[model samples]
Each structure stands twice: as C-alpha cells, then as structure tokens.
Target: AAEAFTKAIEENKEDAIPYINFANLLSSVNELERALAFYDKALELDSSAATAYYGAGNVYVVKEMYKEAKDMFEKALRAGMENGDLFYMLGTVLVKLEQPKLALPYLQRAVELNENDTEARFQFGMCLANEGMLDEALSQFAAVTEQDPGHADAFYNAGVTYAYKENREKALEMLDKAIDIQPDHMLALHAKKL
Candidate 1:
C-alpha cells in the first residue's frame, strides 16, 4: 500500500491525499524519517492537511520526540482536526512533557467530545489530582469506574485520591476493589498494607 501510494504521488504531485496516505503507512511501519518527509510534502502541497499533520505527530510520538509531536498536533488542530482522539493525543503528549496544567483543557475537551473515552477520562482525573483538585479527580475516576467496572487502575487511582483527602475507609474500599480485580496489583497491595 505504501509503495502504491508513493507511486501515485509520483504520478500526480497535485494530489495531497496520496502523500498523507503514504505518510500514514510509513509511520505505521516505523519509517519515521520517511513518514515525516511524506507528511511535510503533503503539507507543502496543501497547508490545510490536518491528517498529514496528525500523521507527523504520530511519528514524532513513536520517536519519543514529544515537543515535536505537540507542535504537529497543534498544527493539526489549527487545520481543523477537531475530534476526541486528537484532543486525547494532544493532552497525553502534554502530560508526557510534564505540562499537565496545559494538558487539562485538551483532556477536558476530549472527554466533552466523547464521554465514552475512558482513557482520556482517567488521564483527566490524574491531571486534576496533580493540581490538587481531589474532588474533581475523584468524580472523573468514579465515572471511569462506572463506565468500566473492572478498571483496576481507575479503582487504584480513586483509592489514592481518597487517601490524599485523608479518607482511609473509602481508600481501603477502593484499593480492595482493585485488588479483587487484579490480585497481583502490587501497588494496591502495598497501599492496602499501609
């Protein structure tokens, strides 16, 4: 598919979609530099190529070059890539860059765009906890627990948040729930011991 797309691009330089498709394929195969080149070509041909920017962002993410990923995702957003997944990726990269404060609004937007985004909701809860918004964090974790009853990490996080608020009984209950779901949950086990 990548070879065919590349040939298509060579056959018609006017079509940016081929470039984007080739870029996506290259990125999926871990061809970071080649994918970036194709994405850049796509953007050059059409500056409003949101998917191209998104493809570039994914490549950067795979490379663990978070700042570059953030820039590319931001460009995608500017090019009108408004979706829950995009917002979630942007927020997640921000968190990776240790900018949870900056990640907050993007995560919030992600959850707003898709209430069923359990991972985004979980990260949003963590960000809230980081910012000392324990109540809000608990609510987000609670929502995740309701949506996914067996989410051990969500239960563990809810427990930790409760502990932070000095609610040992609730914390123990949540941690016990996590332990029940995952018996080998070492962190929950340790927390329970404490």
Candidate 2:
C-alpha cells in the first residue's frame, strides 16, 4: 500500500498532494526545515490548502515555535480544516502558551468531536486540574479511564485530581490502579507518597 502511494505521489510531483506527501516524509525523517519548505510549496500550489498549513504548523510545533505554529493552525482552521486533531493541537499549544482558559474550549471541542480521544481527555483534565477545577478534572480523567481502562496516565491523572479535590482515599485507589497498569508510573508513585 505504501509503495502504491509513493508511486502515485512520484507521478504527481508537481501537484499539491505530492508536495504534501513529500513534506510528511521529510518531517518523519526529522528534516524539519525541508519539510516546512515542502509544505510552503504545497501551499503555493494551492493557496487554500489546509493540509499544507496544518503540516507547516506541525513543523513549527516540532521547532517549538509555538506562536508561529498557532498562527499556522489558525490559518488551517480558517481554510476549513475542522478536524478534531487540529483543535486538539490548538488546545495543547494554547496550554503551552499559558492560556489555559482559552485552551479549554478547543480541547472540549476536540473531545466532543471524538469521545475516544484518551490523550485529549487526559490533557484537558490536567489543564482543569491546574486551574483548580478539581471535580471537573476528576470527571474528565474518569472518562479517560472509562475509555481506556489500562491507560496508566489516565489513572495517575485521576489520582492527582482526586487528591487535589481532597478525596485522599479515592486518590490512593486511583494511584494504585495507575501503578498496577504501569509499574514505572513515577507520577502515580510520587502522588501516593504525597
């Protein structure tokens, strides 16, 4: 399947799709600068190319150019790339930008778009926990655990969230679950000690 996809891409090198594929390949190989260049080329070929914008934004993210990444992501959004992953990325980026409140809505939308987004759920819960929305955070983590029972991070996050909510026994129970799922869950162990 990969070979067929590569052959088709090679046959369409002058098109936006090929450039996007090339950019993705470069990104996977960590040639981030070149990937950005390719994404730019793709966008030049098709000015309204949301995929190119998204790809470029991800490259900026890899370089920790958070503001630039956010700008690119916004462009992609404006260009009508309404994928949940894009919103999820925006939320996480907003968190890094220290705008947790702004991050929440994007993350909520992401989870709404895809209820099975365990990582998004966990991250959103963490953000809520940081903001002192302990009960809501616990609920979010609990939802994550419900979706992925063996998710150690979910359990660990739940433990901390429960602790922050002053539910020590529940916190300990969740910490144990986290530890049982992943024996090396350092955060859970630390929370247990606390």
Candidate 3:
C-alpha cells in the first residue's frame, strides 16, 4: 500500500490527496513521525489540505502533544473540514489540555451532529459534570446508558452525580450497575461505600 501511495504521489506531485492518504496509512500503523513528514509535505504542496491537518492532529494526539493537536484540528476546521468526528477529536484534545470550557462547545456540536455518537455524548457529559451542570450531565449520561448498557464509566459518573444530588438510592443503584458490568472497577465499588 505504501508503495502504491508513493507511486500515486510521484505521478502527481501537485496532488495532495495521495500524500494525505499515505500519511493516514502510516498513522494507523503507528509510524507517527514518518506520517507527520508526509502530512507536512502535503501541506506544503497544498495549503488547503484539510485532511493533512486532521491526520497530523491524530499523530499529535498519540504523542500527547495536546497544543499542537488543538492547532491542527482547528486548522482543519478552518479549511472547511466539518464533521462530527473532527469536532469530537478537537473537543477531546481540548479536554486533554485541561480546557474543558473550550472543549464544551465543540463536544456539544459533535453530539448535535450525531445524536447516536455515544462516545461524544459521554465526553460531553464529562465536561458538563466537571462544570457542575448536573442536570445536563445526567441527561447526556442517560442517553449514553440507553445507547450502550455496557458503558461502565457512564454508570459510574451517573452514580457520582446522583450522590452529589443527594439521591442515595439512585446513586447506589447506578453504582451497582457499574459494579455488575465490571467487577474490577474499584472506583465504582468504592463509590458504593459512600
């Protein structure tokens, strides 16, 4: 595949498409540095290579380079790359950077784009939870649990949230569900004790 991609790039040096695809291929294989090289090359050839930026953003994420990922993802957005996945990625990187407030709108937009995206909803709920948006967080967690019963984290957070709301019975109930799903989940078991 790499050979074919190189051939495509060689045949059309002006085309940024093959270079971005090649970069993504390397990214998926954990060849991050090399993938970044290809991404930069693509960007140099075409400033509007939004996919190149997005691919590089994922590379930065894997490296825990939150600031760089944030820049790349935002650039992708500016380059007209609009999608739920992109929004989620951007939001998640902001979360990693400890900028939950900034992550809020992007994550909410992600959920608005795809209501069925359980992970996006889960992340959004986390942001809401941290911001003390208890009611909103509970609603998002409820949606996630409804979509994915096996989401232990959702149950755990819901349990914690209920505890905060001073609803002992509901908190215990949610914690029990989490414990049932993953017996080794120490936090859920621990939360149950309180």
Candidate 4:
C-alpha cells in the first residue's frame, strides 16, 4: 500500500490526497511520528488540507500533547472540517487539561452534530457534573443510558448525579448497576461508598 501510495505521489507531487491517504495508513499502523511527517508533507503541498491537520492532531493526541491537539483541531475547524469527532476529541483533551468549562461548548457541539454519540454525551454529562450543574448532568447521563442500556460509565455517572440530587436510593441502584457491569471499577466502588 505504501509503495502504491509513494508511486502515486511520485507521479503527481502536487496531489495532497495521496499523501493524506498514506498518512492515514501510517497512523492506522501506529506509526504516529511518520504519519505526522507525512501529514506535514501534505500540508506543505496544500496548507488548506484539513484532513492533514486532523491527521497531525491525532498524532499529537496519541503523544498526549493536548495543547497541540487542541490547536490543530481549531485549525481544522477553521478549515471547515466541522467534524463531530474532532469536537469530541478536543473536549476530551480540554478535560484532560483540567479545563472542563472550556470543554463544555465543544462537547455540546459534538452532541449537536451527532446526538447519539454516547462518548460525547458522557463527556458532556461529566463536564456539567464537574461544574455543579447536577440536574443537567443527570439529564445528559440519563440520555446516554437511554441510548446505550449497557454503558457502565453512564450508569456510574447517573449514580453520582442522583447522589448530587440527594436521591440516595436511586443513586445506589445506578451505582449497583454500574458495578454489575464492571465489579472491579474503582469509581463505581467509590460512588457506592458515597
């Protein structure tokens, strides 16, 4: 595949598409550094390549460079990528950076783009819960559980949300459900103790 991609690139050096494809292939193989380099090459050929920026952003994410991933995602947005997964990834990175408030809008946008995205919903609920918006957090987690009946995190967070709302029995139920899914989950145990 690499050989074919390189041959295509050699035949048409002006085409950024082949480079992006090659970069994506490299990324799929966990060759993140090389993928980033290929993405850079694609960007050099076409600075407006949003997919290249996305590829690079994923590389930074894998490297745990949240700040770099955030910046790259912003650039990809400006380039009209408008990807729900991009927004979700940015929100998650912001959360990791201890910026839940800043993560909120991104997660909200992710949900807007794809309402059924369980992970985005989970993150949105978490951001709200962390910010003391207990009711809103519960609603988000409830939505997640309704959409994904077996999602353990949704059940766990739902338990915490109920606890925040002073519904001890309901909280215990949700917490127990989470534990039934994953007995050794430390967070579930902690929530149960609460």
Candidate 5:
C-alpha cells in the first residue's frame, strides 16, 4: 500500500503531496531515516514545499533532534504554513533549544489560533508562569480547568499561581481540587499543606 504513493508520484513529479504522503507513511512505520530522504526529494521538486518541511519535521522531533526540528518548522512558516499545531511545535522546539523566554509570542499565538487546545493552553500558562506573568498565567490555568477538569496539572499550577499572588485560601482551594481529582498528585499533596 505504501508503494501506491510512489505510483502516484510517478504520474507527475510536479506536486510534492505524494512524496510527502509516502514520507509520512514511512515515518509512521518508524522508517525515520528513509522518510527524510523522501522529504528531501519532495523539496527538490518543489523548492518551497511546506508539506515537505512540516512532514519531515516530525522525524527530527521523534529523534530528539530539536535544532533540526526547529529548522524544518521555521522553513514551513517561511513556505507559508500557519496553523496552531505548527506554532505550538515551533514554540516547544524553541523552548527545548533555547531560553524559554523566546517562545512566548509563538506560544501565545498558538493558543490564539486554537483556544480550545488543552495542551497548548496549559503549556502557554506554564511558560507565562515561568516568566512571572502571574495574572495572565492564572487566566490560562483557569481556562484549562474549565475546559478539562481532568487536567490535574492545570489545577496544581493555578494553585501555585494563586499562592504566589498571596491568595492563600484560593490557592488551597485549587490545590485541594487537584488532590480530589488525583489523590496521588505529589505536588498537589505537598502544596495544599503549604
């Protein structure tokens, strides 16, 4: 079935979709190194192929190659890919590769593009919290719990944010919520008592 993509590519090598699809299929099967070759081939055919860069980017992320991951995603943006997932991944890769501060705007845009994405909101909140943007971070954490009560990390983080703002009772309230949802939440267990 994978060879079908090769068959499709033969029809007209002009479009990079078939090659990118084949690369994605191969990447999914953990034929990671081979996947990159296919993506590069796609790039050669279409000099500004967003699909090639974005699809190939996953391979590097899977391999913990953050620098290359960033490179590919950055190229995707240059090649005209603008979506929440792309923004979020680029932000995360930046955080992994450089100082956390540099990822704020991208992460913020990521959340703006997909406000309903729980993980993006949570990560943006965590990043804001790290940067001492307590109120803004609290709003994100609050939104996370509203969207996903099962997000114990959001509760724990909101609790910590409240504590930082000297709202001890409110902080304890959020921490207790976290422990109630997940009794063995270690940080919630310790923080509620503080």
Candidate 6:
C-alpha cells in the first residue's frame, strides 16, 4: 500500500492528498522520518493540509516529542480539523507537557464530541481533579466506571477523590472494588491499607 501510494504521488506531484496518504501509511509502519518528509511535502503543496499536520502530530507523539506534537495538532485544529480524536490527542499531549489546566478545554471538547470515549472522560476527570473540582471529577469518574465496569483505574481514582472529600465509607467501597478487579495494583493496595 505504501509503495502504491508512493507511486501515486510520483504520478502526480501536484496532488497533496496522495502525499498525506503515504505519510499516514509510513507513520503507521514506524517509518517516521520518511513519513515526516511526505507530510512536509503535503504541507508545502497545500498549506491548509490539516490531515498532513495531524499525521505529523501522530508521528511526533510516537517519538515522545510532545512539544512538536502540540504545535502540529494546533495547526491542524487551526485548519478547521474539528475532530474528537484530534482534540483528545492535543489534550493528552498538554497533560504530558504538565499543562493540565490548559488541557481542560480540549479534553472537555473531546468529551462533548464523543461521550462514549472512556479514555477521554478519564483524562477529563483527571484534569478536573487537578483544578480542585473534586465533585466534577468524581462525576466524570463515575460515568467512566459505569460505561466500563472493568476500569480499575477509574475506580481507584474515584476512591482517592472520595477520600479527599472525607467520605471514608464510599472511599473504602471504591477502593475495595478496585482491589477486587486488580489486586496487584500497588497504589490501590496502599490506599486500601490507609
């Protein structure tokens, strides 16, 4: 498929779509440098290439280059890429960059775009917790647990939040559930002991 896309691009240097398509395939196969070159080519041909920016952002993320990823994702968003996954990626990268407060709006938008996305909901809960919105965070955690019963991390986080709220009984209950699901979870085990 990558060879085919490359051939397609060779056949038409004026088309940006084939470049972006090949870039995506290359990025998926861990051919990051080549993928970036193709993405750059796509951007050069069409400055408003949101998908190319998004593909480059994904490659940057794989390389743990959060700063570059953030820049690319922001450019994609600026180019009218209104996608839940894009918002989620931007939000997660902000969290990785230690800007949870700044990540809130993007995460909130991601949740609004895909209510069923448990990971986005979980991250949004964490952002809320970071902002001292314990009640709201707990609500988000509860929703996550409800949506996916086997989410031990969500239960553990809910337990910690309940502890913060001084609801010892509920905290203990949540902690117990987390332990039941993932007994080797050291943090939950320690929390249960407390």
Displacement of residue 53 (Cα, Å) in model 1 is 1.2
TM-score of 3: 0.91
Candidate 6 stretches greater than 4 Å from native:
none
What's model 5's overall lDDT?
Answer: 0.89
Please give the TM-score that candidate 6 achieves against the real structure: 0.94
Question: Worst 10-residue stretch by lDDT in candidate 2?
Answer: 1-10
- Give one digit per residue, the lDDT tens place, for model 1 in 52-103: 9999998888889999999999999999999998999999999999979999
Write model 4 residue lDDT over 1-194, tens digit each, in one string: 45787787886989999999999999998889899889999989899999998889989999999899988888888887987998998889899889798999989899989998988999999999999888888889989988988899888888887877888898999899898988887999976875
> Which candidate number would show the highest TM-score if scored against the true structure?
6
lDDT of each: 0.92, 0.86, 0.93, 0.89, 0.89, 0.93
- Candidate 3 local accuracy as lDDT? 0.93
What RMSD does each model have against the real structure? 1.7, 3.6, 1.7, 2.0, 1.9, 1.4
In terms of lDDT, model 1 sits at 0.92
Q: How accurate locally is residue 168 in candidate 1, as Cα lDDT from 0 to 100? A: 86
Please, what are the lDDT tens digits per residue for candidate 5 over residues 79-110? Answer: 99999999999989988876669778889999
Indicate the TM-score of model 1: 0.92
Note the residue pairs that clash in candidate 3.
Answer: none
lDDT of candidate 5 at residue 145, scale 0 to 100: 85
Scanning candidate 3 in windows of ten residues, the lowest lDDT window is 1-10
Expressed as tens digits, the lDDT of each residue in 147-179 for candidate 6 is 999999999999999888988899999999998
The local lDDT score (0 to 100) that residue 92 gets in candidate 3 is: 93
The per-residue C-alpha lDDT of model 2 at residue 155 equals 83
* Counted clashes in each candidate structure: 0, 0, 0, 0, 0, 0
Candidate 4 regions exceeding 4 Å error are none
Displacement of the residue 39 alpha carbon in candidate 1, Å: 0.7
